[PDB]
Amino acid sequence: ITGDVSAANKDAIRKQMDAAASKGDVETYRKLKAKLKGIR
Fold first, then answer.
1. Number of domains comprising the chain
2. How far is residue 22's CA from residue 26's CA, in Å, rounded to a whole number?
3. Rounded to an integer, what distance in angstroms lies between the CA atom of residue 36 and that of residue 29?
4. What induces or represses its expression, per the UniProt entry?
């Protein structure tokens, strides 16, 4: 089912963020984080 509302989406984004976050490429992490902080 394509019902991956923020519940699922958030999770996915989280992984990508965590990786690029504490991995050196914090650039993408920061950006993503911001958006996630506004995800209505």
1. 1
2. 7
3. 10
4. The scaffolding protein negatively regulates its own synthesis when it is not assembled into proheads.
